[PDB]
């Protein structure tokens, strides 16, 4: 057991898009939740299924650090049940979800004059993303009956859209970096723990 890489998932440089939501499997290390709850610098920081206080006395099989960027006004959907354009076609959290949602404002990084179109999101998907499902299909959404087979026009829509992150946008339209932590409960050896190193 060692210390986990939270200084990389959070203190990162480039972030993925919501439809292509990143993920980093964490195992073989005893974490350090101090920098996370004592942070006080995030905007949205809630845990569903466990109190951040009683985490250092807990151990886990694996920890999943899903990280992506969405406009702040949409962080409300990164939570169980909560729906919308992000929880339906981009990233859906299960009802029995047991983890934490951590997000912070980042327009000082992901907002370039004229629009930092590096971040995208999904507009159409015939299927609502099943809990943790991924829809990175670039297939032209066939709006109408006549197929598309290529470039768009009517009845043909490029399923992805962009984010015009400008440093002057509204407090809600600004980009926010999210981190969704998942916790694994398996009857197998546990390689993740909090300051509970007395059990190895």
């Amino acid at each position, epitope marked *: 057991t060692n210390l986990c890489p939270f200084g990389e998932v959070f203190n990162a440089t480039r972030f993925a898009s919501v439809y292509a939501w990143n993920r980093k499997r964490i195992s073989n290390c005893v974490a350090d939740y101090s920098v996370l*709850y*004592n942070s006080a*610098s995030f905007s949205t920081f809630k845990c569903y299924g466990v*109190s951040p206080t009683k985490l250092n006395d807990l151990c886990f099989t694996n920890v999943y650090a899903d990280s992506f960027v969405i406009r702040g006004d949409e962080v409300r959907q990164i939570a169980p*049940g909560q729906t919308g354009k992000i929880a339906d076609y981009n990233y859906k959290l299960p009802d029995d979800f047991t983890g934490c949602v951590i997000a912070w404002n980042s327009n000082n990084l992901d907002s370039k004059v004229g629009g930092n179109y590096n971040y995208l999101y999904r507009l159409f998907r015939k299927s609502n993303l099943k809990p943790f499902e991924r829809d990175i299909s670039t297939e032209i959404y066939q709006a109408g009956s006549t197929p598309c087979n290529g470039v768009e026009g009517f009845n043909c829509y490029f399923p992805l859209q962009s984010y015009g992150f400008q440093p002057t946008n509204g407090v809600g339209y600004q980009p926010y970096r999210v981190v969704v932590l998942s916790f694994e409960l398996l009857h197998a050896p546990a390689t993740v723990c909090g300051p509970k190193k007395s059990t190895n």
Partner: antibody
Amino acid sequence: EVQLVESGGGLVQPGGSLRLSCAASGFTFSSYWMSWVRQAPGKGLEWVANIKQDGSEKYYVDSVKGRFTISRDNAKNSLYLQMNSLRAEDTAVYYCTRAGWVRGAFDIWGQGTMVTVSS
Amino acid sequence: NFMLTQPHSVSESPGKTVTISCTGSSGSIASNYVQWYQQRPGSAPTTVIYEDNQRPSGVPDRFSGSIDSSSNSASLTISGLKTEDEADYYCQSYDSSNLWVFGGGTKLTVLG
């Protein structure tokens, strides 16, 4: 078992100094965020200051910024609040409260000491 | 400029159930945990609900915390009311811009 006792309150006319102090007893003091929450008589509760569990970073309401100095002492299980250049608005009952982490949970509340500011 | 708004007084009979609302002004509840502190007259506050819906050790089942996903507001519901529950209920939370904010308080009166 956990208890918090505050002393040092009283009466002072506008502009004078005063120093509140809280006596912690019952928990691993070196593991909680200490905050001062004041409540004017007949009014609601209003947070005032919050010092980190290791004395690193302190926070205050903009009302008292530049005049109130929160300060803790882990070894002596104590928390202080130097109230220099007091105003009449500051008249309230000050309580010392325990946090644990940043987001919410003002766990326990001492009985608090009264601070009256009237010339 | 993130305030917490709360009604002044709510009154209900002994056995019935009452609900106290806590709406969020410029800002957004449900983005952070919500607490509910009970303050009987002349006494220091006690925590009845912490982390939007958890009752501490010793708080009766009568107290329940809910965090509305629609109207941007959390609500405290004291079911099967007791005369001892008459008190002042304040709701608190945290925001990145404005720090720990409290509600205006509600005087829950158990009609006698």
